[PDB]
Design a protein around this motif. Structure first.
Motif, short mmCIF file in Angstrom:
data_model
loop_
_atom_site.label_atom_id
_atom_site.label_comp_id
_atom_site.label_asym_id
_atom_site.label_seq_id
_atom_site.Cartn_x
_atom_site.Cartn_y
_atom_site.Cartn_z
N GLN E 3 -9.68 1.90 4.08
CA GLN E 3 -8.97 2.99 4.74
C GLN E 3 -7.46 2.93 4.53
OE1 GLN E 3 -9.57 2.68 8.98
NE2 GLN E 3 -9.74 0.44 8.91
N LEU E 4 -6.80 4.00 4.94
CA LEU E 4 -5.35 4.10 4.88
C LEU E 4 -4.84 4.75 6.16
CD1 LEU E 4 -5.18 5.46 1.24
CD2 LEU E 4 -4.16 3.28 1.91
N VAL E 5 -4.10 3.99 6.96
CA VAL E 5 -3.58 4.52 8.21
C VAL E 5 -2.10 4.85 8.09
CG1 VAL E 5 -3.28 4.15 10.68
CG2 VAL E 5 -5.25 3.15 9.49
N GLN E 6 -1.78 6.13 8.23
CA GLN E 6 -0.41 6.59 8.06
C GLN E 6 0.35 6.61 9.38
OE1 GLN E 6 -1.62 9.79 4.51
NE2 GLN E 6 0.16 10.13 5.83
N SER E 7 1.68 6.58 9.29
CA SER E 7 2.55 6.66 10.45
C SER E 7 3.96 7.08 10.03
CB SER E 7 2.60 5.31 11.18
OG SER E 7 2.74 4.24 10.27
N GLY E 8 4.76 7.53 10.99
CA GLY E 8 6.13 7.92 10.73
C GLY E 8 6.34 9.41 10.58
N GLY E 9 5.79 10.19 11.51
CA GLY E 9 5.97 11.63 11.49
C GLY E 9 7.35 12.07 11.93
#
Lengths: 211, 306, 225, 306, 217, 211
Positions: E3-9
């Motif tokens: 998986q790939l968990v994104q952050s920093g909106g």
């Protein structure tokens, strides 16, 4: 096409002198520049490779320098055997190119020519042609005037000269002048003469014979 | 045509003086000895030097037939080329290509196949490259083996190197001597057509060594082995053979995560690396790092301190 | 003893073809880049073609691209240059040369070993053997203890011609003048040797003249009259 | 950027399934078996497959600590990474990179250095890749050795491959079996993440094999070892990684003396070579010849008969 | 599990900078080519940047060259995208993606694993939290998430315990410049007053969590 | 930049039909063409890589073909879950580029909508604005006509409607029209009506309430 331009196109110098030949490239060839020496009638000899490396067997007095576009062949102490033509050559990229070459000649003390004259052989006279030959052996400088007189008549247009390469040991020159006549014209005349003017002679010298 | 070094981490590359992987980078003063290795020698514009060849698995191997030395466990190998052809000693090289370029005892196995019936045999064997019988340039060397009656004459025989040994009776780590060249012609004559020794000429600079650890097979051997060039670099330069725009290529050791430069170094046209540092030092590098050619610089370029 | 020996050449009509050979000795030719360099009469050096080392690949000057083919034969250790559709601008002395260092393809070093050269002449004109006449020694060719004598090699085509004395046993003191082009379109030269006056009565002097383009070989004894 | 193959003769290249040089080219029908090697597998646009890695000296080598097995002359090896770090089974590869991809007994030497005092030791050893103790994917294998009490626990141990053996009491050349994959996890489960099997799908074509002769150490082994790609081609493709314009690349085998073509072949994008021929054949080639890439062609290009 | 968990909106006025993170699990991110792809509101997909596999080297769309910087950290298996001097044309949902095959640099396979995306809004306007109003009643009830900026807004019913037959509509851009939407639910008319329907809306561009219950008469 | 054009821009077929989407490239991209499906609000999912290779986990009814400039995605047995946007993408050359996308929507039997109407809340009126919302639930086709009437006055310009993307098992849509008024205007009037016209209805259905 990478153009190589040598300077100068010709030079003359005394034994022991410092001689400098420069080569300039149309664009950078790094250090992939080589120098060659060519004696007349012989294959060139590698002297310097990679702008500054001395080929083995080549005397220490040869040396090279430079990179990019400008290069120099230097002869620290010119020698009589160093006579000949020098070519710079790049091997950086194809097409491999040469400089137009540089003639290197040696200066020395004046030497008067020894003047010999050769009448045509009887064997040539049978074929219907007569060649008279005048020799100027071992002289310096190269400049010399050789005139043919047939029964005191100055000849024009029926002679050819040939000069040797500068001697690699004593730096002198040798010259042959050949006067060509029909067997008919040769036999109607008596005195054949070759008068030579040269710096080594206090007054013009004449060698001659009677047919 | 643009010069490059392959994108390979240190551990992905192979030592050029012994068939083993590189492990690390080392620098130090080299005044107290002559750095003149004959394997791993290549110019950046593609000229192989010394005894360097292309195959990483053929370094320190030997092929030929053998003859037993009576009353011993030793065999004389008449050397052949890799393709089992007659070796030619008149070729203008120091020794057969791939020949060991250090004094020391190398251990591996002698293997042999009988051509007529396909029967095979293999034994542990040691070759001493400082021995008087070590004369590869003349086409002959000697092995000490575990057998004294098994190996046959007139049959293809190969020596596969594994590691190095050391007489434990002598001072520890006194052999092999990696910066001492063997006498390829033994007592017969001196070495010929050697690749030149190298040394940092520019002040404040030291050689950068590509270090491996040779396996030990007995005793207390010095297992450090440094090469001037990774074998892949040799293979790469030979293939590419790109023109050197200068005598010195500026390399940056880079971290591919960010592009950040750990240090810089000089790759010399004649085929070796220097760095700006003083003293012995095991370089600490990110495992993913690699060298990157950035530009050709003047011969007298001053590196940033490593 | 590293050496390059050349063969072939000669003269051919414009549009014709010729083959040059270059046999190597003392080194494996296929390991080094080999080059053909040519020199037109009285001109400088021009690069013609190169082949790389063990990996080969070939290179050509635009002048000869599509007309010339460089190749080699490892089993004969020989380099070849095949020339076709030849024109007058190809008339030159052709030299083969070897690169200093071994490379995969074409390297960047100089050329340290050279062939002796082969003459190539592209001309519509016919071939003519030379007439050889004695230039006899006499009192009018004497200086000090030495006498000059020689051979007039006249009316031949094309260049070159080779002149030896006493079958090559006499090499000291020989001056072979550069050939001149006569108004007839033929060449002529002289070969003059300087010998001791004391030898004139006892020593035989014979010029040996070879003209390969016409397969003419002449031996002329030169004596006082 | 343009696709290429290295300019190397066959004998100048290295077998990619065993640390030995290539010797010759071979073609033969391969219907009677499954061709699925896991070493020497790479796409032409630079993707490593199977257990293929870059260095040729690492093929069929092992690193780790060893433990003696009571009542035998055998040792279990707990595998480590090439850099002596912990090996990770969960990585989506069939086995540690460089793991042997055939069934048979590989003989070589186990060497060991004692970390504390620098003492070393070496013995002949064989790994049987066809038996249940061969479980490299699980991080454990087993060696049969000469020794019984000499190897120490908790010490860096390396296995260097040399050759293969065979039992003379059985039919000759009945081992090794180069086209039979070992079970990387033993009987615990099936092989995973394998490089696909290859077979000529075009009528009139057979596989082209890059053939080496493995050294034999005992008995009458079958010493033929065939790979689909030389190791140098793998290394090259990994670096270059040029885009494939089609699924098939046309190659000419040329003699650099004249540029004359001996035969042409197809280099498939997925990384193997086919020629137009029927039957077993040892290709007769000039020893200076090499492969040259000429053009990308349609999948169904019909090669000239080799 | 890969998986790939994104952050920093978040959002920022033009000229400003903003950071993006993409943490990976189940694979070593440094062995694979990673890519940032963006998708403007109701538009197609556009390639923004990529970094190669183990050998790195970076690549950028001409639209973002010299403005965006892609990079990674092997130590913590994370891909980054530093964006600076942002414009309105950079307003989109940013996805990170992983190339299918392992390569030295940038390869040619497809992108097999994707992140969940990250909203990046480039606007000089400020932030407004949403007011939530009930939509009281075989039956039907809902929430009116009115007056907010910008998107998105998370809505779940009973924090996810009862999301069977639930419709949450795409936001509408009101003439005021603010977004609003509706979330509605199908329940049986005899779900009594014994089920307790609480909508859990969410607008974390301002950190607001409303627990509004939907009661009939 | 290599532009990708994929046709049709949109299509609508029924369950079981073979659906085809083509991709045309600006120039040859060999076989480096990949197909993705993207559900609303979710990251795209890889279907096909390398023109014709099926991605692991993707149902077998998806296939791909073509090389060079023309490529084709085929859905052999269209399923209700196959709804969404489909993109082609080339990974042959930098910059990587996508097609414009193809919207695939499902055809099913006509279903009339269930209509509900929701008066504004108590709290919303305190803010000075009132929203009346009409819900159309689970219908097909998407085509629908919603008209607001406030005391029989047809409203215009003061209402917005949003439609959920096609649900992926029932293949139906849902629609919400939102009428927005001031508090004053809202309490000025009495009857609020939502008149819905749809193919699934014989005559226009009206939902109403008295304030």
């Amino acid at each position: 096409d990478i153009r190589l331009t040598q300077s100068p196109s010709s030079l003359s110098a005394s034994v022991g002198d410092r001689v400098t030949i420069t080569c300039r490239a149309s664009q950078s060839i790094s250090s992939y520049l080589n120098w060659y020496q060519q004696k007349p009638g012989k294959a060139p000899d590698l002297l310097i490779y990679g702008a500054s490396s001395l080929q083995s067997g080549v005397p220490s007095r040869f040396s090279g320098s430079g990179s990019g576009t400008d290069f120099t062949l230097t002869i620290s102490s010119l020698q009589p055997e160093d006579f000949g033509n020098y070519y710079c050559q790049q091997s950086f990229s194809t097409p491999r190119t040469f400089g137009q070459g540089t003639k290197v000649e040696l200066k020395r003390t004046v030497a008067a020519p020894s003047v010999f004259i050769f009448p045509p052989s009887d064997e040539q006279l049978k074929s219907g042609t007569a060649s008279v030959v005048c020799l100027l052996n071992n002289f310096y400088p190269r400049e010399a005037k050789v005139q043919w007189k047939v029964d005191n008549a100055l000849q024009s247009g029926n002679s050819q000269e040939s000069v040797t390469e500068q001697d690699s040991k004593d730096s002198t020159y040798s010259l042959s002048s050949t006067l060509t006549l029909s067997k008919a014209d040769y036999e109607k005349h008596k005195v054949y003469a070759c008068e030579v003017t040269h710096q080594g002679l206090s007054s013009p010298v004449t060698k001659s014979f009677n047919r | 045509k643009p010069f490059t070094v392959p994108i390979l981490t240190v551990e992905e590359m192979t030592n050029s003086r012994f068939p083993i992987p590189l492990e690390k980078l080392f620098t130090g003063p080299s005044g107290a000895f002559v750095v003149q290795p004959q394997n791993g020698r290549c110019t950046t514009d593609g000229v192989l030097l010394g005894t360097t060849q292309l195959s990483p698995v053929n370094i320190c191997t030997f092929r030929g037939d053998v003859t037993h030395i009576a009353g011993t466990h030793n065999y004389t190998m008449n050397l052949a080329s890799q393709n089992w052809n007659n070796y030619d000693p008149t070729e203008e090289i120091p020794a057969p290509l791939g020949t060991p370029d250090f004094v020391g005892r190398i251990q591996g196995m002698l293997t042999q196949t009988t051509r007529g019936d396909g029967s095979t045999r293999g034994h542990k064997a040691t070759v001493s490259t400082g021995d008087v019988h070590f004369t590869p340039k003349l086409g002959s060397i000697q092995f000490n083996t575990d057998t004294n009656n098994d190996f046959e004459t007139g049959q293809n025989t190969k020596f596969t190197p594994v590691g190095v040994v050391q007489d434990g009776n002598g001072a520890h780590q006194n052999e092999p001597q990696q910066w001492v060249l063997p006498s390829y012609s033994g007592r017969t004559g001196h070495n010929v057509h050697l690749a030149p020794a190298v040394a940092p000429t520019f002040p404040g600079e030291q050689l950068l060594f590509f270090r491996s650890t040779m396996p030990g097979c007995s005793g207390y051997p010095n297992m450090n082995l440094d090469c001037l060039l990774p074998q892949e670099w040799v293979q790469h330069f030979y293939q590419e053979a790109a023109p050197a725009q200068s005598d010195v290529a500026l390399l940056r050791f880079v971290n591919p995560d960010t592009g950040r430069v750990l240090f810089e170094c000089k790759l010399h046209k004649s085929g070796y690396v220097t760095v700006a540092h003083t003293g012995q030092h095991d370089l600490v590098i990110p495992p993913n790092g690699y060298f990157r050619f950035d530009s050709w610089v003047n011969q007298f370029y001053t590196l940033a301190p490593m | 003893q590293v050496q390059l020996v050349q063969s072939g050449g000669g003269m051919v009509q414009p549009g014709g073809s010729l083959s040059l050979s270059c046999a190597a000795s003392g080194f494996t030719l296929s390991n080094y880049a080999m080059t053909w360099v040519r020199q037109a009469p009285g001109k400088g050096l021009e690069w013609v073609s190169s082949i790389g080392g063990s990996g080969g690949t070939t290179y050509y000057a635009d002048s000869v691209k599509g007309r010339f083919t460089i190749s080699r034969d490892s089993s004969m250790n020989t380099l070849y240059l095949q020339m076709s559709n030849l024109r007058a601008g190809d008339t030159a002395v052709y030299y083969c040369a070897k690169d200093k260092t071994r490379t995969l393809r074409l390297g960047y070093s100089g050329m340290d070993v050279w062939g002796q050269g082969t003459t190539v002449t592209v001309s519509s004109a016919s071939t003519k053997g030379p007439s050889v006449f004695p230039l006899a020694p006499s009192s009018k060719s004497t200086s000090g203890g030495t006498a000059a004598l020689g051979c007039l090699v006249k009316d031949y085509f094309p260049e070159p011609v080779t002149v030896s004395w006493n079958s090559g046993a006499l090499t000291s003191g020989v001056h072979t003048f550069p050939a001149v082009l006569q108004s007839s379109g033929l060449y002529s030269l002289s070969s003059v040797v300087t010998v001791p006056s004391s030898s004139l009565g006892t020593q035989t002097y014979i010029c040996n003249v070879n003209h390969k383009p016409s397969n003419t070989k002449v031996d002329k004894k030169v004596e006082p009259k």
